[PDB]
Design a protein around this ligand. Structure first.
Ligand code: CHD
Ligand code: CHD
Lengths: 355, 356
């Protein structure tokens, strides 16, 4: 009886070649992308090819790959290597990764787990901050992928659906921020403004009651507490695209408006745990590199393989499994408020034993 | 001994219905709050306040004859100053003042009282635990103007407590009231009651300036939910939205009606102010709750008001501020860099500190 530890997120293409199919999946989405009716399938192809050149340039501009997959797997591995030493009752812990839109997709990793012999599996959403658009979709696909590949409930699932202030996280973001603050002249240090940048969200998700904005803010404040508020800081938002209004102080505009007003400025990837397109591209090449004030624009190191961070992830799964609950008590609220053309309508059915 | 001045500050409300017109004119004249026109803001304010005064006036008669803000402010100042007198003998006697941005006594009024009383050291104590430029930033700008206008000698040395989202007593007091209000729900349904932390909302173009408010409210929310051990589901929501512009949501009213038939109970927690006011006694008590069909599984958490744990926590907040010689937090220069104002402070180190 081995235990599946499944790191989940929306993923990125490990290689430039995987960009079309990645995009197709995203635009084929039920929930998020505006549904014609049945016709995502069709029209999603008609936009993936349209947008595949531009996003391909980008991934090539950072080394021809999204680092999400390697970093997901690597994390999932050291987690289980501590897990198998820390929770014997649960061992063996077999690491897995399953992305909502990149490879390996949810179906592709479910069948691997089924041939592999896992009996209970932990859907460990790699987002410390639940949003229905992220950790909701990843769950709602898992349900579809449970009714298909497993209509007689061989694998018993739970889900770590958020962890905004796990202390390995909070602590790893400090130290990192402090050590990235030491790259600054030193008479400036304490006046560098820590700009915490989270991927944004349409206002129409925000206005449903989504948990994501406040849960990000909880992580920021906890960091600044351990930093004893040495520095100024603001939580701002990046990655706005499309025509509808999105959330709150666009990261790029704030840095411009501040550039000629500040001795310096640090960017913090507050809402993801490894480098990906948002860090290596949008900030490094896009917000920092295309800027006059680039010499005072520095970015804090992403979490990735941070020893302190991975151990904090370890104790999180450790304490999730040993306290034997299937999901946080926010999750029924999350799904009652979220909007989706095909939703989990009972998380009791989805997680736990049902053979 | 000379007294050191402890000045609770917030927008205020009209103590009596006859102050409604003055209060509304003050509010609609404040271009930091509702930007209409560089030049004619104060004539236009005159009109709007003539127009909307009888509607607001009836609303206050419906909750009992006026805003209890002033009463609770002055009561908190007094109870806090009397803790400081035992706590901070070095700056005793502590003399309590209140100064409201639009109500009476206004900040000009309260300043003049302070000069006359001989105060030489004063703390602008913003009663908002969550800084917003349109409340605390605007209030700081008002104080600068009264600095120049009434006190060019710089008789008064000012500091400001410009925020305090996770003061311990405030967290605790909220947790005690939430737990206490939850006793009024049966028990098999208690852990299912949804705690809706309801904060007054922001126009999105204010949010989009990088205003500090929404994220700081969320810090209080999460800290409270930590003290409660996440026993209940909770969401942070926003009320008091008006009119055409997109505001921050979700909206308290529409979230409660959507959730109504799906929930065992809703609790509304007045997370962003410290006493009863129109928001709680009218908009929540009478509107979202009084007029709902699920109104018997709807309850509001008691405001902090005179809560001792909250008052003791405010006392420590001031005591810690005095014994620190911080004129203001490390956030304030950033607040002012991003805030939008036609008459901003510009140079907070001239505003606060000795310049006698
Ligand atoms: C005359 C002045 C514009 C002069 C100018 O700068 O060109 C205009 C600008 C906005 C106007 C005001 C606003 O429209 C609000 C009020 C509207 C009422 O019709 C009369 C008084 C009232 C207060 C107006 C008086 C006058 O029409 C104002 C004051
Ligand atoms: C008086 C005016 C319109 C009243 C009416 O509909 O008749 C209303 C519309 C928006 C209101 C404001 C916003 O709702 C937000 C703030 C909420 C605070 O509780 C009081 C001041 C506060 C700044 C409000 C004061 C005032 O009553 C306003 C300005």
């Amino acid at each position: 009886s081995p235990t599946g530890i499944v790191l989940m997120n929306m993923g990125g293409p490990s290689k430039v070649e995987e960009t079309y199919d990645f995009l197709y999946q995203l635009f084929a989405d039920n929930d998020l992308i505006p549904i014609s009716a049945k016709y995502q399938k069709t029209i999603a192809k008609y936009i993936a090819k349209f947008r595949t050149p531009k996003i391909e340039k980008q991934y090539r501009e950072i080394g021809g790959g999204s680092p999400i997959r390697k970093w997901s797997e690597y994390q999932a591995t050291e987690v289980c290597k501590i897990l198998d030493k820390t929770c014997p009752e649960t061992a063996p812990h077999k690491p897995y990764v399953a992305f909502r839109y990149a490879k390996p997709l949810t179906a592709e990793t479910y069948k691997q787990m089924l041939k592999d012999g896992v009996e209970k599996a932990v859907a460990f959403s790699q987002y410390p901050h639940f949003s229905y658009s992220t950790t909701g979709s990843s769950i709602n696909e898992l349900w579809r992928q449970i009714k298909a590949l497993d209509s007689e409930r061989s694998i018993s699932w739970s889900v770590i659906d958020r962890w905004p202030t796990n202390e390995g996280l909070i602590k790893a973001f400090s130290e990192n921020i402090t050590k990235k603050l030491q790259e600054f002249p030193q008479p400036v240090r304490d006046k560098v403004v820590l700009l915490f940048s989270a991927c944004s969200l349409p206002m129409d998700v925000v206005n449903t009651g989504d948990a994501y904005p406040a849960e990000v803010a909880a992580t920021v404040y906890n960091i600044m507490q351990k930093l004893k508020f040495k520095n100024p800081y603001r939580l701002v938002w990046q990655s706005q695209v499309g025509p509808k209004p999105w959330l709150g102080a666009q990261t790029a505009e704030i840095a411009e408006f501040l550039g000629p007003k500040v001795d310096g400025l640090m960017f913090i990837p507050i809402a993801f745990t490894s480098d990906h397109i948002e860090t290596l591209h949008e900030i490094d090449l896009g917000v920092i590199g295309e800027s006059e004030y680039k010499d005072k624009f520095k970015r804090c190191e992403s979490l990735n393989g941070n020893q302190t961070f991975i151990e904090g992830m370890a104790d999180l799964v450790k304490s999730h499994l040993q306290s034997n609950q299937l999901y946080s008590n926010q999750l029924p609220l999350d799904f009652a408020l979220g909007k989706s053309n095909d939703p989990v309508k009972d998380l009791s059915l989805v997680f736990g034993n049902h053979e």
